């Protein structure tokens, strides 16, 4: 369930020191992050036959006209 | 970019798999028997103004001869400079070889 979540549970840049308490007094919603990703975790290490055949058994094409109906 | 073996011989053996897959028909290959007899190509042109940077270049090669470098800053004043003949492709292949080593050796497991 997506209820409200604190700032320190979101992988984002936070506030260190008394500025955290300054932020929690001025900001309207204290549990929103600045949105800048965590440089220390986010992208830290860079990226550096018949038994199994069905196409030949596709459903056939049969048309029903007034004669066969 | 056109790659090259460490021994120096060209990786490309002129399938024309290149000319067939290319959705925009930007690959032009003409080949014949070399003097040593080993099958190589004397014409290999890419119309970078016609290419869509699809990536079927790199996927089609059975010898990894044609690959797409991580470069994007090669804008040119005259459009004629955007028609890459074989020598221009081979120049990039040498010029970007170490970088292509980063790309392939970091994408080897997933292919």
């Amino acid at each position: 369930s997506g209820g409200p979540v604190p700032v320190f549970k979101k992988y984002t840049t936070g506030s260190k020191g008394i500025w955290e308490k300054i932020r929690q007094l001025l900001t309207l919603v204290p549990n929103r992050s600045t949105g800048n990703p965590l440089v220390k975790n986010y992208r830290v290490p860079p990226p550096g036959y018949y038994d199994r055949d069905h196409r030949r058994n596709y459903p056939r094409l049969v048309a029903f006209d007034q004669t066969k109906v | 970019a056109l790659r090259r073996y460490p021994s120096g011989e060209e990786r490309c053996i002129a399938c024309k798999l290149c000319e067939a897959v290319c959705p925009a028909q930007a690959i032009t290959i003409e080949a014949e028997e070399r003097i040593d007899g080993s099958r190589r190509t004397y014409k290999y042109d890419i119309d970078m103004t016609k290419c869509i940077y699809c990536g079927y270049c790199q996927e089609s090669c059975p010898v990894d001869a044609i690959v797409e470098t991580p470069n994007v800053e090669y804008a040119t004043e005259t459009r004629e400079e955007l028609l890459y003949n074989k020598e221009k492709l081979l120049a990039n292949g040498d010029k970007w070889e170490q970088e292509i080593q980063y790309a392939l050796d970091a994408d080897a497991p997933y292919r």
């Binding site: 800048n36 | 028609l83 980063y102």
Partner: protein, 139 residues
Amino acid sequence: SSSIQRTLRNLWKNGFKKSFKQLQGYNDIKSGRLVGTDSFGNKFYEVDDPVEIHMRTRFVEYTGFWRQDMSEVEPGWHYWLAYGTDVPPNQLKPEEKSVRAYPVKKHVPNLTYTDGAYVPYNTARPKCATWDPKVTERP
């Protein structure tokens, strides 16, 4: 990350000369550990500040003063500046490097707007060969 506290620290460490170079092209006085230079001459730095944002932890300082061209960056380092690898090109183990049988001369940037610009041409001879004039007289 943008306040004057970071700028003043980076101003004092770098000295006036390097910073004024950053105040001419970079527009942001930054400092970092030098990680080496390429063949062309660009100096590749990495920042150890805990305040820089995610994508700004690796930068360069070009050789030129007034004009900077991105293509001057050597291809080996060009992948490092793009955050695709944690191993700088001068720290590669020899089992991974590129070994070529041909000389590797100095890096050359993109050569547009200059007479050194690349010119395409057709590498194939014309497919029809004309006949050489030859005459032998009536016997």
